[PDB]
Write a protein that binds this ligand. Sequence first.
Ligand SMILES: C[S@@+](CC[C@H](N)C(=O)[O-])C[C@H]1O[C@@H](n2cnc3c(N)ncnc32)[C@H](O)[C@@H]1O
Length: 224
Amino acid sequence: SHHHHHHLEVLFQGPHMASKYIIEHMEEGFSEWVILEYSQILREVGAENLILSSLPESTTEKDIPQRLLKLGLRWTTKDLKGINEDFKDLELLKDGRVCLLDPRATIDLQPEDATKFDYFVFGGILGDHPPRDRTKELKTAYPNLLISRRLGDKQMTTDTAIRTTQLIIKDRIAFEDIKFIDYPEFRFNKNEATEMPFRYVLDKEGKPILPEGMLDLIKKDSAQ
Ligand SMILES: C[S@@+](CC[C@H](N)C(=O)[O-])C[C@H]1O[C@@H](n2cnc3c(N)ncnc32)[C@H](O)[C@@H]1O
């Protein structure tokens, strides 16, 4: 009775060829907000295409939210340069072929960058306004691995940055063609409304795309 000690999910997804998305986790633990965000990301890019890296060394499976485990989250306490040690199935993370999505970069990501990078890295950061520039910690941590690219001049949530990167790289849509809304207001009644100071991508109904559950969380907050 050893037959469950396997890596079938990995065998089933290979051989690797497709762009991957890596989130360097940079929050303590997993708040409800983070869980909803990461759940949405998993659903949009596919569990086989996401890695959550740099978790604290003491992290074990019980510390990972069951909602994320159920959606297939691949997670590791290794940093970017140790990911290949844990996940032997992934393509090598090659110097210069790993793109840091960096709000301060001087050059915006473009569809032709699909040819130029195999991995796209995001800070798992709940941003502040004004931004605290915490993404810069990644640039200093991996100075020869990463090349920075921008997603326009306003801050996006992690799931929005990944959604935008997928539209540019996978769907080959130029940034200037993506329909965004800057700093949307969410109003529910005369007593309850909240602005979110990020840039969001719009769905075909003209509404900002939020993780499932997030509008409920914003409504619960406004009701307090
Ligand atoms: C909410 S943001 C955090 C930004 C962080 N507060 C800062 O000022 O560096 C989450 C992640 O999505 C990516 N991101 C968000 N907005 C971006 C932009 N305008 N350009 C490039 N990457 C962006 C970055 O990888 C970032 O770490």
